[PDB]
Structure 1
Amino acid sequence: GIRKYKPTTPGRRGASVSDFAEITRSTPEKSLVRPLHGKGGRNAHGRITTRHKGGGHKRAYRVIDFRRHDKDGVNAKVAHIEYDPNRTANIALLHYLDGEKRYIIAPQGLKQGDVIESGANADIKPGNNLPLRNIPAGTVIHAVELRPGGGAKLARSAGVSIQLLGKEGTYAALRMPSGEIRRVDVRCRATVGEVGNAEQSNINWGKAGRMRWKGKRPTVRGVVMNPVDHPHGGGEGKTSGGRHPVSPWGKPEGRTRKPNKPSDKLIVRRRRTGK
């Protein structure tokens, strides 16, 4: 759950963490690890592509079976629900009957011992990936794909995931966490159940070291920025810039969504906030 840390030092007074009692193994599988490195917020070209992030704690990579489609009709027990920091959620390894173990996203309330099926015959216990032909309308879903068989991309937020609304014709309607409705094929791949670590939103950061570890760099406010560096720069004292806030990269607040996407016709309306 959530465990709050006692104030031993003035720095870690407010630090509270979601204790990971949901851990079973501590040393990740060495076979599936691929060579990875912190890119430092920089491309191969050497320029800093995005500031406020980079540096920190070098970490490893592991392949997740996001698009599980190659093998079907075989069951798998939950091997060990381990901790992968490269995601907000957790990964629970599976012993499939063919002996080919792949990592998958651990759904909410998953504990070691449940049997998971991936295919048409799969039931409604969480972790079962199956096309929309075999799912009731109205069930909460996660790790949702966009086409019948091109790899799953969406619905992997910890705690709130996409909810299926209804099927009409050959197009299916999906409700977004933002409260929006997206039209998607009735043959895409989607799983059942919410994603775990819902209590992760109750994490309290704590200090700056954790944050350089996590990746982000300290944020430099524009009002003290130099005027050449930023439109908010300059001033003798504290000033807001004398104009509406603007990213120093030229454009102010506003529309950024370029229309006319191939899935733009597959969207009914855009998000509305604070209702």
Structure 2
Amino acid sequence: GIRKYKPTTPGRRGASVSDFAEITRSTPEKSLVRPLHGKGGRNAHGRITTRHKGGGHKRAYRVIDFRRHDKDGVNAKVAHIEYDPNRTANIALLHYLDGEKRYIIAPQGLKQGDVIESGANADIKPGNNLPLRNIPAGTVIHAVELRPGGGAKLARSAGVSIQLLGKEGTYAALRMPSGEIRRVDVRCRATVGEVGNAEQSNINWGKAGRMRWKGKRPTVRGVVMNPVDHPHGGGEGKTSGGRHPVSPWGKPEGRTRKPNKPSDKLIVRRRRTGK
């Protein structure tokens, strides 16, 4: 759900927050959590790799299972849905019949007290897994594997979805969330359904602290920048920089995909903005 604050202080006017009507617990299993440390956005050398990224709040990582082929043909039960900051969407706790406990992304429309099939010949119930070769055409899927035994490395954010087109030989066609079409071996695994919590977009923050806790630092505009540290800097007054916009490091906009990539001569087409 979505809740909107009633304005009572100048800073909070227009703020909103997502109503967590889908959570059942607020305590991850002690055996499945692993620690994590504040990182700061630097690297081994210590140079600032990406500007204005830092600060925030201490977070504890929880392990997730993106393999889902070690266990096959054994049913599972949906137990609980848990809070998770590390990724945009919510997650679910699974109880396998043999007794193991495991974690997966919470698909849209799922609720407590249900049955999930993970067999290679399982049903079309949402949240199930089975190889691309065995999925009927026209269904919506997520957690796509870029290739067999590679783990779900695509379409993991909230509200994303993939649509399955026809099939050919060992190849299948997928509609990318951004309109692209890509081919992948049918031997890989995937999951039916889409990521829930589709109301992520409508969140209005309106407060500096709500960004600082997440760890976003100011941006400092270009024109105000002094000429030495910037290409637009300098000038008396304020101007457009006296030169067509260029990155702060000398290289302008335009082509950004490295040509002659092994996928360059195999993949079909590119995006089109705002059709």
TM tier relative to shorter chain: over 0.9
Contact 2:129 2:191 in 1 (8 A): yes
Query: What whole-Å deviation, never above 9, does each CA across 1:88-119 have from its counterpart, x for those lacking one?
Result: 11110111112221110101011011111213
Alignment partner, residue 146 of structure 1: 146
Q: Which is worse superposed, 78-87 or 118-127?
A: 118-127
In 2, Cα distance between equivalents of 1:265 and 1:204: 43
In 2, Cα distance between equivalents of 1:249 and 1:74: 55
TM-score (norm 1): 0.96
Query: What whole-Å deviation, never above 9, does each CA across 1:168-219 have from its counterpart, x for those lacking one?
Result: 1111111111111001111111100111010111111221111111121111
Segments of 5+ residues of structure 1 without an aligned counterpart are none
In 2, Cα distance between equivalents of 1:108 and 1:56: 29
- Deviating runs (4+, > 4 A) in structure 1? none
| RMSD (Å) for aligned C-alpha atoms | 1.3
Query: What whole-Å deviation, never above 9, does each CA across 1:38-75 have from its counterpart, x for those lacking one?
Result: 31111132111111211111111111112222111111
In 1, Cα distance between equivalents of 2:106 and 2:34: 20
Contact 1:36 1:59 in 2 (8 A): yes
Query: What whole-Å deviation, never above 9, does each CA across 1:112-148 have from its counterpart, x for those lacking one?
Result: 1111121312211211121112211111110100111
TM-score (norm 2): 0.96
Q: Does 1:253 align with 2:230?
A: no
Contact 1:72 1:117 in 2 (8 A): no
Q: Which is worse superposed, 258-267 or 141-150?
A: 258-267
Q: Does 1:208 align with 2:208?
A: yes
Q: Does 1:60 align with 2:50?
A: no
Q: Which is worse superposed, 44-53 or 190-199?
A: 44-53
In 1, Cα distance between equivalents of 2:126 and 2:253: 40
* Distance change (3 Å), C-alpha of 1:259 and 1:98: farther
**How many residue pairs align between the two structures?**
275
In 2, Cα distance between equivalents of 1:128 and 1:263: 30
Contact 2:75 2:96 in 1 (8 A): yes
Contact 2:231 2:249 in 1 (8 A): no
* Distance change (3 Å), C-alpha of 1:64 and 1:204: same
In 1, Cα distance between equivalents of 2:126 and 2:107: 6
